[PDB]
Amino acid sequence: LFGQYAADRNALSYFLNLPPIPGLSLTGGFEMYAQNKSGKDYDAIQQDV
Amino acid sequence: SATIGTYYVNDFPMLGKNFQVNIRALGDFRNTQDALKNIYIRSSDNKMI
């Protein structure tokens, strides 16, 4: 499937096999949240991120 | 309530969280017992009473 859709065209396609365990991540990728307290606009938050 | 007391109309945004908006008369006017004399209200005939 990846070979078929190598050309982006107008869509971004990611093909994944379903998780072996629902609600779990095999890679262990951390989930990190950076909380803004001053109240900066989301554009500035995205720039900093 | 608005002149003598505190009237919480709605909320306004500051530092992300919502904070109250309160209407009250200047403390000097509410001090005396005869504060009612200074206060005014408009009848249905658009006359101040």
UniProtKB/TrEMBL annotation, chain A:
It is found in: Cell inner membrane. It comes from the Bacteria. Belongs to the resistance-nodulation-cell division (RND) (TC 2.A.6) family. This is CmeB.
Automatic annotation (TrEMBL), chain B:
It is found in: Cell inner membrane. It comes from the Bacteria. Belongs to the resistance-nodulation-cell division (RND) (TC 2.A.6) family. This is CmeB. It comes from Campylobacter jejuni. The lineage of its organism: Bacteria, Pseudomonadati, Campylobacterota, Epsilonproteobacteria, Campylobacterales. The chain holds residues 744 to 792 of 1039 of the full protein.
